[PDB]
């Protein structure tokens, strides 16, 4: 909401370090957050009438942004479903939706993940951006165990104006991203 | 009803509900309730956030289990990947390793069947 616990932290606790850290000149020039994406393949638009909207009202139930129903671009014999419509669910988070999300994720989510011993440190690489996956979806607060017929993993991709990994690394690190280190 | 590692049991007494955990046998479950003075017979569907919390307290730190124990044991079994400990050279070839009759039975450590012909 224009401001959050993490947003502040970034501005008055991370902003400083990085500069002092890599020594940036211009204000802008220092790592900021562009957007964090969270999609789901599902691949379950098969027979039995693949509603799987529950996964849409949910994906967004924990995000606050109804997702965008992506479809198959080509068409594959090998694993049924092809040519069009079928599967695909994905929402793009920016600004405040971006912050009020990462918070929970970093504070309440990542925490309870079967074993979770930090976040694999290689998922950066050349990417002034980062990527990571989740098996469950109940790892979040806004949703409980009872209500969720089936499971639902998902990919989370954070984009950064960072050019290097160190730049990206440090940032997500000063923010609160745990790390398999 | 998520306990150590969000593993969720329910609607029946805790005593057995705890069992529904990889690292909690009927024993470690009966020795876990008296150590927090709760009523065994109570249905998991009712118990102070405290009863549950201090319960998820013990459990988790009292002993290492599922996830961490689960995974861990596999590694236990790994180590027997030395140079040739006869207790490992049975683990490599899915066969019992505690000296069980092999001619017959010993099915549980070898999938269904393979049959083949005779003489």
């Amino acid at each position: 909401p224009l401001d959050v616990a993490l947003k502040r932290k970034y501005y008055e606790e991370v902003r400083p370090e990085l500069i002092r850290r890599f020594g940036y000149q211009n204000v802008w020039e220092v790592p900021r957050l562009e957007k964090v994406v969270i999609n789901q393949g599902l691949g379950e638009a098969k027979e039995d009438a693949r509603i799987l909207e529950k996964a849409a009202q949910e994906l967004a139930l924990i995000t606050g942004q109804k997702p965008a129903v992506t479809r198959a671009k080509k068409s594959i014999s090998n694993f049924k479903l092809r040519k069009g419509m079928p599967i695909g669910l994905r929402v793009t988070l920016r600004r405040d939706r971006m912050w009020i999300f990462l918070e929970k994720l970093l504070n309440v989510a990542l925490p309870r993940i079967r074993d979770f011993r930090g976040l694999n440190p290689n998922s950066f690489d050349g990417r002034g951006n980062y990527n990571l996956g989740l098996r469950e979806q109940l790892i979040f607060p806004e949703i409980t165990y009872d209500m969720v017929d089936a499971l639902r993993g998902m990919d989370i991709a954070v984009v950064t104006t960072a050019e290097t990994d160190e730049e990206a690394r440090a940032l997500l690190e000063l923010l609160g991203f745990p790390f398999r280190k | 009803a998520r306990i150590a590692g969000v593993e969720i049991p329910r609607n029946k007494r805790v005593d057995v509900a705890l069992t529904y955990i990889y690292g909690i046998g009927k024993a470690r479950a009966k020795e876990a309730l008296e150590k927090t003075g709760i009523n065994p017979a109570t249905r998991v569907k009712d118990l102070t956030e405290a009863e549950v919390v201090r319960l998820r307290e013990y459990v988790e730190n009292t002993w290492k289990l599922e996830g961490e124990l689960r995974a861990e044991v596999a590694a236990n079994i790994k180590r027997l990947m030395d140079i040739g400990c006869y207790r490992g050279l049975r683990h490599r070839r899915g066969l019992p390793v505690r000296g069980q009759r092999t001619r017959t039975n010993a099915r549980t450590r070898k999938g269904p069947r393979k049959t083949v012909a005779g003489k």
């Binding site: 959050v4 139930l61 606050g64 009020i100 918070e103 929970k104 504070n107 309440v108 607060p141 | 998820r56």
Partner: peptide, 30 residues
């Protein structure tokens, strides 16, 4: 809407999302 994270590991979290009635059975305490 704002919210509250009522774990068990003490530690409450005042932020935003939907339904400020959250029983986070395990915050960042492990």
């Amino acid at each position: 809407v704002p919210a509250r994270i009522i774990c068990g590991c003490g530690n409450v979290i005042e932020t935003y999302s939907t339904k400020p009635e959250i029983y986070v059975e395990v915050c960042s305490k492990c």
